[PDB]
Structure 1
Amino acid sequence: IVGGYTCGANTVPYQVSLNSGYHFCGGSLINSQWVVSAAHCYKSGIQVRLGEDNINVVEGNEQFISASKSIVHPSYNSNTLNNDIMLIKLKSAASLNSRVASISLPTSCASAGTQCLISGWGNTKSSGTSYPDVLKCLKAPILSDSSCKSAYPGQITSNMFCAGYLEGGKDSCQGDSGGPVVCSGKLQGIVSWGSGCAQKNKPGVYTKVCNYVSWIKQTIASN
């Protein structure tokens, strides 16, 4: 997250870190056994770290649980990042009598202008690289379709939306992929891609979760 602020420990209790040799992607807990992330985060040997704040120091509230299944959307297109969504099943249920909790799925798609919370342990520099120890947060509005399409001609599908600032300076960044965009307590987006980070006229592009609610619920029920 570039241009954000330190969230504070467990103030984003549904945030997870996906760790496979290192932290490499975020995700969002949607019930005690399932995490939503980005399809492009797929890889072997994922451990899900819940209740995390400082990724390098165990200090309380962390739960480290191996993924048992990673189910990429059947229409994911790795060339265009269309349908960039994946569900991860935990090998054991997380304990929610705790700091950890799930995030609700959307009941409708959010509107342009709506302010959302985006969070992650990704790079905090708008050029160069610096990965933070503790979880970062950013408040950012959903941008209009037209401004999104103007920033990313030919590349924005109905399963994507832009959020952030056309003036740049504030954005998600490498290491944030798969993590949450939450708007009024609903999971509306998954960090997916962008041209660089925090650049002028290049806001973040996010998977539009409201298009996938039935796929998510059916996948959870059948796995």
Structure 2
Amino acid sequence: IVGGYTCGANTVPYQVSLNSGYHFCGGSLINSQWVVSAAHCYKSGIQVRLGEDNINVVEGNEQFISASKSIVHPSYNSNTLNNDIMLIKLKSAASLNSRVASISLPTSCASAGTQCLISGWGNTKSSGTSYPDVLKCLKAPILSDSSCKSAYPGQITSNMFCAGYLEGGKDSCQGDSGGPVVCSGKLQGIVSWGSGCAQKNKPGVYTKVCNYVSWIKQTIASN
């Protein structure tokens, strides 16, 4: 997260860290046995880390649970990043408490103007590389479809939305991938892609979760 602030230990209880020997992507806990992340975060041998703040120090509220199954969206296109969403089932259910909690799926799509909370352990520099050990947060508004499409000609689908600031300076970045975009208590986006990080006229692009609610519900009910 570039231009954000330190969230504070367990203030974003649904935030997960996907670990394969090291943190490589974020994710959101949607219930006690399921995690939602970006399809581009797909890997085998994933361990889901819940209740995390500092990812390099055992602080006491963590739950490390291995994934039993991963399901990439049937129409995911790795070249365009269309349908960049994936579900991960935990081998055992997480113990939900005040520090580890699920986030609600949306009942309707969010519109431009809505302020959301984006979080992750990704790169904090627009030019250069610096990865934080503790969770970073950023409040950012959802941008109009017109602005989004003007920024990325022919690359924005109905399954994507832009959020951030056209003036640059604040944005999610590499390492934040798969992480949550929560607006008014509902999971509306998943950190997907962008041209650089926090660059002028190059806002972050996120997966539009509201278009996948039925797929998510059906998949969980049958797996």
Q: In which range does the TM-score fall when normalised by the shorter chain?
A: over 0.9
Deviations 1:189-218 (A, max 9, x none): 000000000000000000000000000000
Deviations 1:98-133 (A, max 9, x none): 410000000100010100000000000111111100
Give SS of 1:206's match: strand
Distance 1:126 1:21 in 2: 26
Give SS of 2:108's match: coil
Asked if the contact 2:168/2:198 (under 8 Å) is kept, the reply is yes
Give SS of 2:29's match: strand
Distance 1:75 1:21 in 2: 29
Asked if the contact 2:106/2:210 (under 8 Å) is kept, the reply is yes
Asked if the contact 1:61/1:99 (under 8 Å) is kept, the reply is yes
Q: CA RMSD in A?
A: 0.5
Deviation of 1:69 after TM superposition, in Å, equals 0.7
Give structure 1 stretches of 5+ with no counterpart. none
Larger deviation, residues 203-212 vs 97-106 = 97-106
Distance 1:216 1:49 in 2: 21
Deviations 1:2-49 (A, max 9, x none): 000000000000000000121010000000000000000000110000
Asked if the contact 2:16/2:29 (under 8 Å) is kept, the reply is yes
Deviations 1:157-176 (A, max 9, x none): 00000000000000000000
Distance 1:21 1:201 in 2: 35
Distance 1:119 1:47 in 2: 19
Give SS of 1:216's match: helix
Deviations 1:135-173 (A, max 9, x none): 000000000000000000010000000000000000000
Distance 1:72 1:197 in 2: 25
Q: Which runs of 4+ in 1 moved over 3 A?
A: none
Give SS of 1:148's match: helix
Q: Do residues 212 (structure 1) and 212 (structure 2) align?
A: yes
Asked if the contact 2:17/2:23 (under 8 Å) is kept, the reply is yes
Asked if the contact 1:61/1:98 (under 8 Å) is kept, the reply is no
Give structure 2 stretches of 5+ with no counterpart. none
Give SS of 1:65's match: strand
Distance 2:93 2:182 in 1: 23
Partner of 1:23: 23
Asked if the contact 2:67/2:90 (under 8 Å) is kept, the reply is yes
Distance 1:31 1:183 in 2: 18
Partner of 1:54: 54
TM-score, structure 1 as length reference: 0.99
Deviation of 1:97 after TM superposition, in Å, equals 2.8
Give the percent of matched residue pairs that are identical in Structure 1 and Structure 2: 100
Distance 1:150 1:60 in 2: 46
Deviation of 1:60 after TM superposition, in Å, equals 1.2
Count of aligned pairs between the two proteins = 223
Asked if the contact 1:30/1:102 (under 8 Å) is kept, the reply is yes
Distance 1:117 1:97 in 2: 21
Asked if the contact 2:13/2:98 (under 8 Å) is kept, the reply is no
Asked if the contact 2:30/2:102 (under 8 Å) is kept, the reply is yes
Deviations 1:34-87 (A, max 9, x none): 000000000011000000000000011100000111100000000100000000
Asked if the contact 1:42/1:72 (under 8 Å) is kept, the reply is yes
